[PDB]
Amino acid sequence: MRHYEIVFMVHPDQSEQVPGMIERYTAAITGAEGKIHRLEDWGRRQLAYPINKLHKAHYVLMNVEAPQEVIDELETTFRFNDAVIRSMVMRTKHAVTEASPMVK
Template identity: 35%
Template sequence: MRAYETLFVLKPDLEKETIEELIGKVKAVIETAGTVGKVDEWGKRKLAYDIDKKYQEGYYVLVEFNAENSVLDALDHLYKITESFIRNIIINKEK
């Protein structure tokens, strides 16, 4: 297993329960073939630029985890099919 971190930005108008549910989905995907380390909710922050001419801010969440490569594809799929994620990145920490 390798060490990764993912940073994702959620729509700023989501309810707290919805945010917790989405974080839970990300953690569940990771736990299929890995372990979740630290989950750091940064909260609402201003975006560097408008996204879709609609969002000037977003709710940022950073998750550190160890996982197999298959988890990366599953996470990417989750980000693409769930419209509440407006931006995301997955980084390999072992460099």
């Protein structure tokens, strides 16, 4: 199992659906026996540059231990859901089960 690290930015108008989305992703990972080492809703945030002409995207961070097949499925979900503006899944060696610097 590969330690991943997902960060996805959601359209601020879809901010009310965000807790549910986190729950869904977690549920799927668990279903596939995937551990979830940290999960931080960073909330609404001012973009350093406007993406698709809109500002203040809702950032979620999620460091996860899962298989790569399930990661692929998650990525597909991100790409097709018209709510999450950007995503980035990036492999890591060690699960960084520690609070993020902005929360810290």
